[PDB]
Every structure is written in C-alpha cells, then in structure tokens.
C-alpha cells in the first residue's frame, strides 16, 4: 500500500556543532541558536538546536524522535529541514536556522512595514508546503502563524510537525469542527487551519475569537459564525478564507487550488489587499555569534549525496 521511506537520518557528534544563544526555553526542552561544522567538509551552517532540558524522561523522547522522523522524510523549500540528530544524554535536534523567527511575531512586530505583495506571497508559500505535505500524505494537525518560520522576509517555511501524522490512523481555535467534535483530521481539516492562519496574517497577528471560551467555539461554528473580514481584505481574499471554513470538508478548497488563487492575486496585489502606504514599504557581516566565518552556507545550499 505504501512506499518504503528511504530518507537518511544523520547522526552528529556534539563537537560538530556549538550553541551560541538561547532562542526559546521551557517545558521539555530549550532550543538554541547555533553553528554547525560538518565533519571533514569546511562549511558552517547556522542551526537551531532543540534539546530536552529535563534530562531524559522515557515518555518524553517519543515526541522528539517522532518530530525527527517526520522532518527527515520531507524535502521542500517551504517546509523546514532537519540536518541531523545528536544522541547525547539528551536527544538533540539540529535544524536549519530561521533567522527572522516566528511569522506570527514578525507580522505583529512589522505590521507598519508589511506590504500586500509580501502577504500574498506568504500565503502562496504556506499553501505550497502544505500541498507538499498532502503529496506526502502527512497531516500537520497544527497549522498556525506561530508554526510558520521566516528564513528571509521573502521566504517562509512550515514547522512543528511533532504532532504530525499520516492520513488515516490544544489549538481549538485553529481546529476544524470535524476535528473538534470527532477528533477527525484530514488534509481538508488542515485547509481550515490554513484559513485561520491566513486570517492571522491579514489581521497582522490578531487573536482569533479573542475573549471566547473554546467550549463555546463548537457551537459558534455550528451556529455558522466565522471570523470577521479584515480591514485590509477585499471580498475576494476574504471569500477564500470563508471557503476554508466551510462545514463540509470536501467543499473546502484544495491547497493546490489555494496556490493558484493567491498567485493570481500576487500578480496584482493592490487589487486584492488595500493597505495604507503600500507602495512605500521596504523589508530587509550580517552574521551573529561568530566573527570569524565567511564559510557560512544556508542549510538549503548544503546538500547531502
Ligand atoms: C513562533 C514563536 C516562536 O518563538 N517560535 C520559536 C521560538 C524559538 C525557537 C524556534 N525555533 C524552533 O522551534 C525550531 C526551529 C527550527 C527554529 C529555527 N529558527 C528559529 N529562529 C528563531 C526563532 C525565534 C527567535 N527569536 C529571537 C528573539 N525573540 C525575541 C523572539 C524569538 C529567533 C530566531 O532566530 C534568530 N527558531 C526556531 C521557534
């Protein structure tokens, strides 16, 4: 029924990479900004290293390992890549560094400077990665603006696959109704989450259903209520979100369709999003935690035979 998964999982020596700074902390683990030099080859790769702070807990490791298994098995420009695993006292995940951080943080921080062309483009990129997930048959089960990371302001990537699962087999606000009521997840259910994600970007990081109980949420959706149209949004952009939130999953648009629609819009962005001073805005040595190296290469340019 299924093809063999012939992805390579790479084991790395601790000496190979160094941790420079702490990006985030808490719960099971903390993730570090880092530099990785691979073996014999003389290149330096910027990495995000995530490791379990609380030593080893036998229950805990399954989640970290599963994340690695899924990450290794994916190759796409708009999906985040796992370089290696380090089997120390604590399992360590070495991943490509997304220098500009969380997409959700980014829109909130830069809302004054984010143009329509960037927004439509981000929408296209997320759909492309998500469609790739669909080709895989993997389901994100947790797609949100928070789970998209930006490598350059013009290039974002889907992330947080730890909960990811194969088709067949909490972020209640992002969840589809079929997921809330019946714990059912499908690529189409994923599409609904994509719509909430699009809404977050359009609203520049606003919180959906703010001040609403999750307990409340199923009824509201059952009621047929949905998220409001964003001020920047034209009816054409808003309608796409609405289709994503339709109760009948098959009725909802496919990611492959979503890529098509957003691109057409991206072709003439001002028509579909109206934002004050759209024309004016601009969005971004240059390496941190090291002075020495100009041998740096992005993970993306670093390929493995
Ligand atoms: C979206 C919320 C969020 O903070 N997510 C987050 C926090 C910390 C680390 C990561 N994170 C990963 O979990 C996994 C990978 C692969 C990853 C890759 N690259 C980054 N880059 C990155 C994230 C966050 C930050 N900051 C620093 C400044 N601080 C105020 C905000 C968060 C910086 C950064 O690279 C500079 N993060 C990753 C995700």
Helix count equals 9
Q: CATH homologous superfamily of the largest domain?
A: Transferase(Phosphotransferase) domain 1
CATH topology title of the largest domain:
Transferase(Phosphotransferase), domain 1
- What's the number of extended β-strand segments? 9
The distinct bound ligands, ions and cofactors come out as: the ligand */C=C/C(=O)Nc1cccc(-n2c(=O)cc(C)c3cnc(Nc4ccc(N5CCN(C)CC5)cc4OC)nc32)c1
Helix content class = 25-40%
Summarize the helices and strands and which ones pair or pack.
Layout lengths: L16 E8 L4 E8 L8 E8 L8 H12 L9 E6 L3 E6 L6 H7 L6 H21 L1 E2 L8 E5 L2 E4 L6 E2 L10 H6 L4 H16 L11 H10 L11 H10 L10 H13 L1 H4 L33
Helix pairs in contact: 3-5, 3-8, 5-7
The structure holds ligand F62.
Main attributes?
monomer; 305 residues; alpha+beta; Phosphorylase Kinase, domain 1; Transferase(Phosphotransferase), domain 1; five-stranded antiparallel beta sheet; two-stranded antiparallel sheet; 9 helices; 9 strands; 32% helix; 16% strand; binds the ligand */C=C/C(=O)Nc1cccc(-n2c(=O)cc(C)c3cnc(Nc4ccc(N5CCN(C)CC5)cc4OC)nc32)c1
Can you tell me about this structure?
- Residues 17-273 form the Protein kinase domain.
- It comes from Homo sapiens (Human).
- The modification N6-(2-hydroxyisobutyryl)lysine is found at residue 50.
- There is a cross-link at residues 21, 42, 59, 62, 223, 254, 264 (Glycyl lysine isopeptide (Lys-Gly) (interchain with G-Cter in ubiquitin)).
- ATP binds at residues 23-31, 50, 95-96, 160.
- It is a single chain.
- With 305 residues, the protein is α+β, with helices and mostly antiparallel strands.
- The chain folds into two domains: 1-97, 2-Layer Sandwich (Phosphorylase Kinase, domain 1); 98-283, Transferase(Phosphotransferase), domain 1 (Orthogonal Bundle).
- The protein is built from nine helices and nine strands.
- It has a five-stranded antiparallel beta sheet with strand order 1-2-3-5-4, covered by helices on one side. It has a two-stranded antiparallel ribbon with strand order 6-9. A two-stranded antiparallel ribbon has the order 7-8.
- A hairpin with a 4-residue loop joins strand 1 (17-24) and strand 2.
- Helix 3 (116-136) runs antiparallel to helix 8.
- The longest helix has 21 residues, at 116-136.
- The two termini are 28 Å apart.
- Bound molecules: ligand F62.
